């Protein structure tokens, strides 16, 4: 009611929204760094070491025990690069056929594939699935290996849970990767892709829901990579259309842009 109270009413919204934005950004950052460590893990213990020290069992165990290191991630998995020329050989050795993600059926002929060979049990259904048979995942895989850095997809509904989230992807390179490599060289030296599923719908709601004063505030997160086409990353809704605040978000991928919008319930 009061006018001076309105000022403080905004100050509160600003503080609450900014804090929640910092928490989200930090938690995301922490998870990205540990996934990065997993990519290095696979490179060191699977490819560099002879013989490999990593099988599905080992990957499952280590990732499970370190799940607390990756908050906001529902699971991690490693997909290996497989060129069509190698497919038969790859499938005979693993004793299973590469499958599409849409139906889990034997994949048709493609130039290359990205089937998951290692997976955290939380996402064990990814095993043998070709990560390139999904458009979001395919684009992430390409940009990942071309840039040599972590990358994020647009928000989309994940496999099995259908939860709205985003996928994080790190490239894994063979030792043959030249220093100061070109994009062409990065592609030629690609071994595989370490991916993480950011279950935003479930895990972000869980983080926010526990915070004091949550019932009083409405929190929305947007992918604004495309100015004219903002994509809802999190949030549903009846709210206070008179006042709002925009908090800054940086999820680490220069190719994507995000922001948080907060309002009062009423």
Ligand X SMILES: C/C(=C\CNc1ncnc2[nH]cnc12)CO
Provide the annotated binding site for kinetin.
137, 159
- Least distance from C-beta 83 to ligand X, angstroms? 17
Q: Does 61 contact a copy of itself by CB under 8 A? A: yes
User: Which of the ranges 14-22, 135-143, 207-215, 244-252 carries the binding residues for ligand X, by CB under 6 A?
Assistant: 135-143
Q: Which of residues 2-41 bind a copy of itself (CB under 8 A)?
A: 30, 33-34, 36-37, 40-41
The answer to whether the beta carbons of residues 115 and 130 sit under 8 Å apart is yes
The answer to whether the beta carbons of residues 157 and 199 sit under 8 Å apart is no
Structure tokens at 38: 């997993």
DSSP assigned state of 110: -
Name the helix (H) or strand (E) containing 147. Answer: helix 135-147
Q: Which of residues 144-173 bind ligand X (CB under 6 A)?
A: 158-159, 167, 169
- Least distance from C-beta 27 to a copy of itself, angstroms? 12
Q: What whole-number distance in Å separates Cα of residue 42 and Cα of residue 124? A: 17
Task: Pick from 19, 44, 206, 226 the residue near a copy of itself by CB under 8 A.
Answer: 44
Structure tokens at 111: 């130039």
Residue 131 binds which entry of ligand X, a copy of itself, none, CB below 5-8 Å type-dependent:
ligand X
> Would you call 118 exposed, middle or buried from its count of C-beta atoms within 10 A (0-12, 13-18, 19+)?
buried
Name the helix (H) or strand (E) containing 248. Answer: strand 245-249
Task: Pick from 7, 11, 19, 53 the residue near a copy of itself by CB under 8 A.
Answer: 53
Q: Does 197 contact ligand X by CB under 6 A? A: yes
Task: Name which of 194, 191, 190 is nearest 150 in CA terms.
Answer: 194
Structure tokens at 182: 């070109």
User: Which of the ranges 46-54, 130-138, 164-172, 242-250 carries the binding residues for a copy of itself, by CB under 8 A?
Assistant: 46-54
Residues at the binding site are: 137, 159, 169
Task: Pick from 65, 103, 111, 184 the residue near a copy of itself by CB under 8 A.
Answer: 65
Q: Does 182 contact a copy of itself by CB under 8 A? A: no
Q: Using DSSP, state whether 247 is helix, strand or coil.
A: strand
What are the beta bridge partners of residue 193? 79, 171
Please give the residue ranges that form the binding site for a copy of itself (CB under 8 A): 30, 33-34, 36-37, 40-41, 43-45, 48-49, 53-54, 58, 61-62, 65-66, 69
């Amino acid at each position: 009611m009061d006018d001076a109270n309105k000022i403080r009413r905004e100050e509160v919204l600003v503080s609450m929204c900014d804090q929640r934005a910092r928490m989200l950004q930090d938690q995301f950052s922490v998870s990205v760094n540990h996934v990065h460590a997993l990519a290095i893990l696979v490179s060191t213990f699977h490819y560099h070491k002879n013989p490999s020290a990593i099988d599905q069992e080992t990957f499952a165990e280590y990732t499970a025990r370190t799940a607390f290191e990756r908050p906001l991630l529902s699971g991690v998995a490693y997909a290996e690069k497989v060129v069509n020329f190698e497919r038969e050989m790859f499938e005979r050795q693993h004793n299973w056929v590469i499958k599409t993600m849409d139906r889990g059926e034997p994949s048709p002929v493609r130039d290359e594939y990205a089937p998951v060979i290692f997976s955290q049990d939380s996402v064990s259904y990814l095993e043998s699935l070709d990560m390139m048979s999904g458009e979001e995942d395919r684009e992430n895989i390409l940009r990942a290996r071309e840039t040599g850095k972590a990358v994020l997809t647009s928000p989309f509904r994940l496999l099995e849970t259908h939860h709205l989230g985003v996928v994080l992807t790190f490239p894994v390179y063979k030792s043959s990767l030249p220093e100061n490599p070109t994009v062409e060289e990065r592609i030629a030296a690609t071994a595989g892709y370490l991916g993480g599923a950011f279950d935003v719908e479930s895990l972000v709601e869980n983080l926010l829901g526990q915070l004091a004063g949550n019932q009083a505030i409405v929190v929305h997160v947007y992918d604004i990579t495309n100015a004219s086409d903002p994509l809802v990353m999190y949030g549903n809704e009846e709210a206070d259309r008179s006042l709002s605040h925009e908090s800054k978000l940086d999820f680490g991928d220069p190719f994507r842009k995000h922001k948080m919008i907060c309002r009062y319930h009423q």
